């Protein structure tokens, strides 16, 4: 009967709770109660980039820290140079509702996707000097949220049919399907060694996935509503999450529980983006009340505010060398801060 | 130099193309279509036309008096829609289609309309309401085998408004019923009391031709009232 199965599930949950409680001998605030605070952090706006017609949904940097790509709700991708505010490429799409963007780590390809349930891969360096569609990957049964590259031949995608997938490009077929979630999937992030990755998927839960075996190692809970963004700590032993209950949190992979919570009593709106700084000391977040925030990642004390946008903020990124922070909003403007 | 000039030439060409694209984008009107399975939105789509597997969205184009309309319908998706709805916060109109000869699934349609009205990213979008399948309603009321008051008790004390404007040659009972049904939606549409968006109700059937003209007039009104707010003229 189902009763025995439910009882066994309850017993195993109780065991997991006890085994996690057995490993708590300090709180991170106590161990970091003798640390010098960062003080005050001030940043300015160096570039403003104009040319889109509607709201922006995504952006992604390159590995040279100079070129970037943006996707907007009018069927256009634009590649920008951030030193001179020039333009290198503008590409029009077949479908207009786009929700993700990516930039390959070799500078040769780009990718995008949206409500058409198809992942599209575009070639940049061609003999004729044009940009043409080079691959369409189809097979998901719902809208596509995020996608990231691993090389010039493999890609990873997450969609709203409650699944994740790995794709080989030349053949055009899936190679492994990650199943186990309950609701939609909103964000995924890759580890710096390209062996594991993390998914945050809209039922107050996050999962760690092994890419070569194809299964789930461990599952983290604690939030109260949907999870919207996710990213990796630089050394691959922690990660941070943001949700619609106006709260950010920081989790550890070897202690298998939640370590830090960032919140305040004057913020009553959700979070749309999360990213880290190069040394790990700064955590940056974007919110729904038109401004972004800068937190110390060891003391849980707010340290900075960025207040330049007149509408909802949805894209936030930090470079590989750590010189700039780029933000994009629903008023169709990008901004570079240094 | 010797490279900066090529870069600037590329930028200027891209800007010219973007201007040509802006001219086309600014002059096209976009509509989002919603309804349930028993509703008849497929027939409406087919009757505005003469004028690939596992895909996610469908598009229809038509033209009235030299104005261009795009209409978007949602296909292969799941039944949880609290996330993709946000993609549509800048459309000109939502076209909501409801079946009126059911008496059993009317509460669900009412709750759907209530949820659409009060959302946070769609509180500046007007709604056009199409109460469909009038002939079946007429037949089912005249026959006299099913009772409306079983599902809405307040029908037992409703009286026709004294300013009724029915079509000639119609039984009073049909008029009473249809006006009650419409008042059910109109009451929900006026609980906010904000004046930021409007509801336009209509009646329609499966043999009709004048739906394009109705959408035309309603969109004319919407755009006029946005114009008189953008340019500080009230």
């Amino acid at each position, epitope marked *: 009967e189902l009763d025995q199965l439910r009882q066994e599930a309850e017993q195993l949950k109780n065991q997991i709770r006890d085994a996690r409680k057995a490993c708590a001998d300090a709180t991170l605030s106590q161990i970091t109660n003798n640390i010098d605070p960062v003080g005050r952090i001030q940043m300015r706006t160096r570039r403003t980039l104009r040319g889109h017609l509607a709201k922006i949904y995504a952006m992604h940097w390159g590995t040279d820290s100079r070129l970037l790509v943006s996707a907007s709700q009018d069927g256009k991708l634009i590649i920008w140079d951030s030193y001179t505010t020039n333009k290198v490429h503008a590409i029009p799409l077949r479908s207009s509702w786009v929700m993700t963007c990516a930039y390959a780590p070799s500078g040769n390809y780009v990718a995008c996707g949206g409500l058409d349930n198809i992942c599209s891969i575009y070639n940049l360096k061609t003999r004729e000097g044009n940009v043409r569609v080079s691959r369409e990957l189809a097979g998901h049964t719902g809208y596509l949220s995020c996608c990231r590259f691993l090389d010039d031949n493999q890609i990873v995608t997450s969609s709203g049919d409650t699944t994740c997938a790995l794709w080989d490009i030349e053949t055009g077929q899936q190679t492994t399907t990650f199943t186990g979630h*309950t*609701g939609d999937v909103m964000s995924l992030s890759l580890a710096p060694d390209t062996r594991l990755f993390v998914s945050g998927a809209c*039922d*107050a839960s996050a999962k760690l996935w092994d890419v070569r075996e194809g299964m789930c190692r461990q599952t983290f*809970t604690g939030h*109260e*509503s*949907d999870i919207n963004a996710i990213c990796f700590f630089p050394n691959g032993n922690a990660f941070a999450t943001g949700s*619609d*209950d106006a709260t950010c949190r920081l989790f550890d992979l070897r202690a298998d529980q939640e370590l830090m919570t960032y919140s305040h009593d004057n913020i*009553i709106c*959700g979070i749309t983006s999360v990213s880290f700084s190069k040394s790990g000391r700064l955590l940056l977040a974007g919110y729904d009340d038109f401004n972004c925030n800068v937190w110390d990642a060891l003391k849980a004390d707010r340290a900075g505010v960025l207040a330049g946008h007149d509408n909802r903020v949805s894209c936030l990124g930090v470079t590989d060398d750590g010189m700039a922070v780029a933000t994009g909003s629903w008023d169709s403007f990008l901004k570079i801060w240094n | 130099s010797a490279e900066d000039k090529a870069a600037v030439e590329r930028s200027k060409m891209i800007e010219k193309q973007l201007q040509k694209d802006k001219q086309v984008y600014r002059r096209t009107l976009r509509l989002l279509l919603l309804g349930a399975d028993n509703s008849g939105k497929s027939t409406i789509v087919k009757q505005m036309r003469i004028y690939v597997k596992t895909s996610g969205i469908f598009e229809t184009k038509f033209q009235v008096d030299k104005v261009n309309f795009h209409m978007f319908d949602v296909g292969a998706q*799941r*039944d*949880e*829609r*609290r996330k993709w709805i946000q993609c549509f916060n800048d459309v000109t109109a939502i076209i909501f289609v409801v079946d009126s000869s059911d008496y059993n699934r009317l*509460q*669900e349609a009412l*709750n759907d309309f209530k*949820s659409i009205w*009060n*959302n*946070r990213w769609l509180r500046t979008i007007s709604v056009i309401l199409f109460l469909n399948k009038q002939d079946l309603l007429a037949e089912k009321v005249l026959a006299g085998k099913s009772k409306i008051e079983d*599902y*809405f*008790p307040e029908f037992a004390r409703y009286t026709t408004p004294e300013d009724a404007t029915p079509e000639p040659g119609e039984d009073p009972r049909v008029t009473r019923a249809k006006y009650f049904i419409r008042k059910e939606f109109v009451d929900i549409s006026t609980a906010s009391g904000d004046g930021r968006h409007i509801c336009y109700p209509h009646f329609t059937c499966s043999v009709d031709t004048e739906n394009a003209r109705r959408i035309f007039n309603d969109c004319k009104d919407i755009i006029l009232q946005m114009n008189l707010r953008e340019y500080n003229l009230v």
Partner: nanobody
């Protein structure tokens, strides 16, 4: 870990009365609004009643007016429904529902594809 648990139910004769209780744990109770839904044999998922944060808004369906009552206790973190004057057409499995987001006034919670924030349900049968 969000959890909702129901109590009350069973078999009753027509004209009887019952009390359905719901205990919630894992989130803040004062900032969310609450819903009562049901599912009948051979049918889909229906909607019965809703209640707001403090209690300034209450709403029912047509077939239950004058018979069912709803209540909320925030100190004890509990939701209550009261059933009077039952009919042979009220036999169903009952569920409690929470809205997805705090500080809002919209609901999208009658779906079937494993909505996240919903209990397992309690069975109510009326016969003689």
């Amino acid at each position: 870990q969000v959890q909702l648990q129901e109590s009350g139910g069973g078999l009753v004769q027509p004209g009887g009365s019952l009390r359905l209780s719901c205990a919630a744990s894992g989130f803040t109770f004062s900032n969310y609004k609450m819903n009562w839904v049901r599912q009948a044999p051979g049918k889909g998922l229906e909607w019965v009643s809703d209640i707001s944060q403090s209690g300034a808004s209450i709403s029912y369906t047509g077939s239950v007016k004058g018979r069912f009552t709803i209540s909320r206790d925030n100190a004890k973190n509990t939701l209550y429904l009261q059933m009077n004057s039952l009919k042979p057409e009220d036999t169903a499995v009952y569920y409690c529902a929470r809205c997805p987001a705090p500080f809002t006034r919209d609901c999208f919670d009658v779906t079937s594809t494993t909505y996240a924030y919903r209990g397992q349900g309690t069975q109510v049968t009326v016969s003689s």
